[PDB]
């Protein structure tokens, strides 16, 4: 492998379908120390053996090269996932082709597609598998994956057949029909930039090529050998051979036509090959049946039963069970107890009795119809389903005896409740569901220590994380997608977060089993040193640190958390980076951190299943890792606290009620509450906080709502506090930072009012009311159509009121002063109060005012006539002008008492005074167009 351009881990990521090289990914490019892979989907390389030297072709069959027999097995002993398979037969061709029969059915992969036809003429093959590389120029491009003696630009690992080091080659075909000893062979050359040259240990590995018309990767053949040395090194592929393949497969077929009758089996007779059953019917065993290398294969769309004669106890043993699509096999015997039952195929195994053995399933449905149906279950490869159909059908221990490796499968609780201390899932290929739409399944997960569920939840499920005693370390962390009716949390923490994308590593054991003499620095260390400089300049050390993922990596999968309701009691809920959370929260004596900085990763994520596939490993690290997070819904809380952190985006579109529940909005958060929010406590905010009417209900249309904060709101930075669009906001607002905004839709509205005009007796206009005390001596205040009733002494920095504005209200003969420092009011409204001999308000200190305006007043003294006494109404020294409260002889006022004013008095402070009285859905905003 050449790592002068590409990172070492890049070749590995591709071969192991990690990082950006997920199966089916199109338009993939990688940064170099910039490179675009060809316009094709990434292959699925899961049909490759762990060591790369052979390729599964589905079922009990695999393909490799013939002279790999001489090799230290290399291909005689095959590992897929947690399972070992042994070649027990083969056929072999002069062109070095080898089709293999394995001792058991492969559970982990459905195998590579075998539709390559070497006997088509050159033009046909070019048109079927050719790739455009410019202007219509076709080349046959493909991928090869294996793990020969491994080298990274002159760093010698001396490692061969390591699964961790499974590495990918990209190539173009240079001769479809090269004339070699043995027969015609396909010749290829690697890409000159993304260059993984073939090594001896790669011999036998599968070569892939992509069908244009069927849109699928196809097994071209298997790697035969090389000629040459560096960049131009040629590789020869033994073309896949159907005829020889099919001849080997013929050696294992015994057709059994049951045809709805009954086939009785015993004594070497039916009244090793695979027994290939057809027609449906009953299968009865008179004794233990051991099929050796054979197993059961069932056709499609048929019903079968497997029974013991006379209700005896008989076991079956063999290659496994392969059930065709649309078929169901009622399995009413035991599979042998010293062997795993391997189930593949798309149909259903219906297990009527307990088995006292282990299951390995990779496809179709296995139904558990008995208590403790299997001792342990291993789910692999993606498309299998395990379905509960009896009480206590799962197994014992923390994991309920079920384990999901790579790509996982589905657990359908099917109306049953199931409890796990821990779910043993390696990745989000796993989902726990419930297909029963009429009886909800309670899924309980009651880990007492840090644990991450990597899998999903959907269907008719309720999720509970309940403990008997308050335990703050019992953190349940969900890394996958969660779709649940509801979620309930008591006494133990819940964490919702995204998933750090898994990458390949070079070696999972932390030791190098070669002494320092004769071997020196660890090759693992050497790769990290060799890429250190470019990693220091780009800040990407996570690429070469031999860890599966890193808290500081940028590549994170966003996860969806949807639920009608979450209930928390006496614990904490954290939404961390790349969680997208939506639903209603009820909280009691609990802590809610939205946009929490602490994220968790699993050092064995994606490789959590060990041993024979019935043991589970997990190692958790946590630390700061800041990224976008989303909460959408409502919050009903009692005590505890709520925290909204950097990069979080919260949308309260459901009514929120906080009682003794402090709300803190930190710097870098965006909180929009389009739904009513009441709180007996206070809200602190150093981010953006916006309060608006319900802009929902209709696809258009907006109804209004309220925001009360008894403990007031407090602003903590150069922040934003915006109220607009039919928002009625109660509770004082204080601040000593340079804050801004807002009251009132900034020209986003007018006079054309929708909604109930009986719901206009709560805002008059505007479409925004507030009340009513602002102590912010550094802060701005926009006022496009508003304002407040002012219930306290407000000393505000700056003010701009293009539109409807402030009045006073309303302490019992308790008068207050507003005080600005750049009051540029561009229009109406300024209703002030006084009884007669006691008046308030000394406003703008540093002048600059606006056009039109309306400085008004009102009372509690019954002056049946005039009272021509001296009480000022503003205090702007010298002033820019005077006509900043123009003479409009149309004042309704309060009662029938209308006094007048002045122009100037004490020094430069241009005040306003008083005079006498007069006599004159029926209004305040009756002066917008004045």
CA–CA distance, 593 with 249 (Å, rounded to integer): 60
Could you tell me the CA-to-CA distances from 842 to 815, 845, 859 in Å, in that order? 11, 8, 18
Spatial CA neighbour of 615 closest among 441, 401, 812: 401
CA–CA distance, 190 with 144 (Å, rounded to integer): 10
Active-site residues: which are they?
67, 96, 203
Contacts of 228 (CB under 8 A, 6+ apart): 234
Name the token pair of 834.
Answer: 């006084």
Contacts of 56 (CB under 8 A, 6+ apart): 47, 48, 49, 62, 78, 80, 106, 108, 109, 111, 112
| E strand map for 497-590 | 499-500, 556-557, 559-569, 572-575, 579-588
Question: 601, 581 in Cβ contact below 8 A?
Answer: no
Name the token pair of 873.
Answer: 């109404």
What kind of experiment solved this structure?
X-ray
Contacts of 665 (CB under 8 A, 6+ apart): 644, 671, 683, 684, 685, 686, 687, 689
**What are the extents of the domains in the chain?**
1-252+499-557, 253-498+558-930
Q: Cα angle at 902 between 898 and 905, to 5 degrees? A: 145
Pairing between β-strand 713-715 and β-strand 733-735 as defined by DSSP bridges: parallel
Question: 74, 225 in Cβ contact below 8 A?
Answer: no
Could you tell me the CA-to-CA distances from 225 to 95, 204, 230, 413, 683 in Å, in that order? 12, 9, 14, 51, 71
Interruptions in the chain after residues (C–N over 2.5 Å): 33, 271, 868, 920, 923
The residue assigned the tokens 């057709």 is: 255
Name the token pair of 452.
Answer: 């991450």
Contacts of 433 (CB under 8 A, 6+ apart): 410, 411, 412, 413, 457, 458, 459, 461
Question: 551, 621 in Cβ contact below 8 A?
Answer: yes
CB atoms within 10 A of CB 503: 24
Contacts of 353 (CB under 8 A, 6+ apart): 331, 332, 333, 334, 369, 370
Spatial CA neighbour of 840 closest among 811, 818, 869: 818
CA–CA distance, 564 with 560 (Å, rounded to integer): 13
Resolution in A: 2.3
Spatial CA neighbour of 409 closest among 393, 433, 390, 389: 433
Question: 666, 643 in Cβ contact below 8 A?
Answer: yes
Contacts of 52 (CB under 8 A, 6+ apart): 15, 145, 146, 147, 148, 161, 166, 201, 202, 204, 205
Q: What is the SS3 assignment for 30?
A: strand
CA–CA distance, 788 with 855 (Å, rounded to integer): 15
CA–CA distance, 773 with 10 (Å, rounded to integer): 60
- Classify domain 1-252+499-557 by CATH number: 2.40.10.120
- Fold of the 253-498+558-930 domain: Pectate Lyase C-like (2.160.20)
Q: What share of the chain is helix, strand, coil (3-state, %, to 5)?
A: 5, 35, 60
CA–CA distance, 275 with 261 (Å, rounded to integer): 16
DSSP 51: T
Q: Which residues pair with 523 in a beta bridge?
A: none
Contacts of 51 (CB under 8 A, 6+ apart): 74, 78, 79, 147, 161, 162, 163, 166
The residue assigned the tokens 């499968």 is: 409
The runs of H, that is alpha helices, within 366-412 are none
Contacts of 699 (CB under 8 A, 6+ apart): none
Distance of CA 118 to the CA centre of its chain: 43
Question: 903, 909 in Cβ contact below 8 A?
Answer: no
Contacts of 372 (CB under 8 A, 6+ apart): 354, 392, 393, 394, 395, 396
Distance of CA 890 to the CA centre of its chain: 62
Spatial CA neighbour of 453 closest among 475, 423, 421, 433: 423
DSSP 865: S
Contacts of 393 (CB under 8 A, 6+ apart): 368, 369, 370, 371, 372, 373, 416
Question: 732, 771 in Cβ contact below 8 A?
Answer: no
CA–CA distance, 771 with 67 (Å, rounded to integer): 87
Question: 710, 681 in Cβ contact below 8 A?
Answer: yes
Could you tell me the CA-to-CA distances from 178 to 92, 171, 202, 239, 617 in Å, in that order? 20, 16, 20, 11, 48
Name the token pair of 460.
Answer: 């008719």
């Amino acid at each position: 492998m050449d790592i002068s351009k590409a990172w070492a881990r890049d070749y590995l990521d591709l071969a192991q379908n990690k990082g950006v090289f997920q199966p089916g990914s199109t338009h993939v490019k990688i940064k170099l120390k910039d490179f675009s892979f060809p316009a094709l989907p990434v292959p699925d390389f899961s049909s490759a053996t762990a060591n790369g030297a052979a390729t599964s072709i589905g079922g009990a069959y695999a393909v490799t090269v013939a002279h790999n027999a001489k090799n230290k097995s290399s291909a005689n002993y095959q590992t897929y996932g947690s399972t070992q398979y042994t070649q027990i037969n083969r056929m072999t061709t002069g062109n070095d082709f080898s089709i293999q029969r394995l001792n058991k059915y492969v559970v982990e992969t459905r195998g590579a597609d075998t539709s390559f036809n070497y006997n088509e003429n050159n033009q046909n093959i070019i048109d079927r598998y050719g790739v455009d590389v410019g202007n219509g120029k076709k080349e046959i491009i493909g991928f090869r994956v294996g793990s020969g003696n491994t080298t990274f630009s002159g760093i010698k690992t001396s490692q061969t057949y390591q699964a961790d080091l499974l590495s990918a080659s990209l190539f173009h075909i240079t001769n479809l029909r090269a004339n070699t000893v043995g027969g015609n062979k396909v010749e290829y050359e690697n890409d000159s930039y993304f260059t993984n040259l073939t090594t001896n240990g790669d011999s036998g590995s599968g070569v892939y090529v992509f069908d244009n018309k069927e849109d699928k990767w196809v097994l071209l053949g298997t790697t035969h050998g090389i000629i040459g040395n560096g960049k131009t090194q040629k590789t020869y592929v033994t073309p896949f051979d159907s005829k020889t393949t099919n001849e080997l497969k013929q050696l294992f077929i015994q057709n059994v036509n049951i045809d709805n009758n009954t086939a009785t089996i015993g004594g070497g007779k039916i009244t090793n090959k695979d027994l290939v059953f057809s027609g449906g019917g009953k299968i009865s065993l008179k004794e233990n049946l051991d099929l050796g290398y054979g197993g059961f294969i069932f056709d499609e769309n048929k019903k079968y039963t497997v029974s013991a004669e006379g209700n005896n106890n008989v076991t079956f043993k063999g290659a496994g069970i392969d059930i065709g699509k649309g078929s169901t096999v009622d399995w009413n015997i035991k599979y042998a107890s010293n062997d795993a039952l391997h189930k593949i195929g798309e149909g259903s195994l219906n297990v009527i009795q307990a088995q006292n053995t282990n299951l390995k399933t990779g496809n179709g449905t296995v139904i558990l119809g008995a208590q403790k149906t299997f001792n342990n279950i291993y789910v692999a490869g993606g498309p299998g389903t395990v379905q509960l159909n009896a009480e206590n059908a799962l197994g014992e221990g923390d994991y309920a005896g079920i384990f999901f490796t790579e790509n996982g499968g589905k657990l359908d609780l099917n109306g049953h409740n199931q409890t796990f201390k821990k779910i043993a899932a390696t990745d989000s290929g796993t989902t726990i569901t419930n297909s029963n739409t009429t009886k909800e399944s309670v899924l309980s997960v009651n880990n007492q220590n840090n644990y991450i569920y990597h899998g999903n939840v959907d269907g008719n499920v309720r999720l509970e994380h309940h403990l008997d005693t308050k335990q703050d370390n019992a953190r349940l962390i969900l890394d996958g997608d969660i779709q649940a009716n509801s979620i309930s949390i008591k006494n133990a923490p819940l964490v919702m977060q995204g998933h750090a994308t898994d990458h390949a590593i070079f070696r999972t054991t932390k030791t190098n089993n070669c002494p320092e003499f004769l071997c020196g620095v660890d090759w693992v260390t050497r790769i990290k040193n060799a890429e250190n400089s470019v990693n220091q300049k780009n800040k990407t050390t996570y690429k070469s640190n031999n860890q599966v993922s890193d808290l500081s990596q940028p590549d994170w999968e966003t996860r969806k958390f949807r639920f009608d309701n979450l209930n928390i009691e006496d614990s904490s809920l954290s939404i961390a980076r790349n969680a997208d959370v939506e639903g209603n929260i009820q909280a009691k004596n609990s802590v809610i951190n939205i946009g929490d900085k602490t994220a968790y990763i699993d050092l064995y994520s994606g490789k959590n299943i060990t041993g024979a596939g019935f043991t589970f490993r997990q190692d958790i690290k946590s630390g700061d890792s800041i990224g976008e997070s989303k909460f959408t819904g409502g919050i009903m809380a009692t005590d505890g606290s709520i925290s909204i952190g950097d990069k979080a985006i919260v949308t309260l579109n459901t009514v929120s009620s906080l009682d003794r529940t402090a709300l803190t909005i930190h710097k870098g958060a965006n909180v929009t509450a389009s739904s009513s929010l009441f709180t007996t406590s206070n809200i602190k905010s150093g981010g953006d906080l916006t309060l608006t009417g319900a802009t929902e209900s209709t696809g258009e249309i907006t109804p209004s709502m309220f925001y009360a904060a008894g403990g007031y709101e407090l602003t903590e930075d150069g922040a934003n506090f915006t109220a607009k669009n039919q928002a009625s906001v109660t509770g004082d607002i204080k601040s000593e930072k340079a804050a801004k905004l807002s009251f009132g839709s900034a020209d986003k509205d007018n006079s054309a009012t929708r909604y109930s005009q009986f719901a206009l007796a709560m805002l008059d206009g505007f479409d925004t009311s507030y009340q009513g005390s602002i102590k912010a001596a550094q802060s701005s205040l926009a006022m496009n159509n508003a304002l407040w009733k002012v219930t306290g002494n407000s000393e505000l920095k700056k003010l701009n009121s293009t539109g409807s504005m402030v009045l006073f209200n309303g302490g019992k003969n308790i008068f207050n002063t507003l005080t600005v420092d750049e009051l540029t009011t561009s229009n109406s409204a300024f209703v002030m109060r006084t009884n007669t001999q006691q008046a308030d308000q000394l406003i703008v200190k540093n002048k600059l005012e606006g056009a039109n305006n309306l400085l008004l007043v009102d009372f509690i003294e019954k002056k049946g006539n005039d009272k021509n006494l001296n009480i000022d109404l503003v205090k702007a020294p010298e002033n820019t002008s005077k006509d900043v409260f123009k003479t409009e002889t149309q004042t309704i006022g309060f009662s029938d008492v209308t006094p007048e004013i002045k122009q100037q008095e004490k020094d430069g402070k241009s005040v306003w005074t008083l005079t006498g009285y007069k006599t004159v859905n029926a209004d305040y905003k009756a002066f917008l167009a004045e």
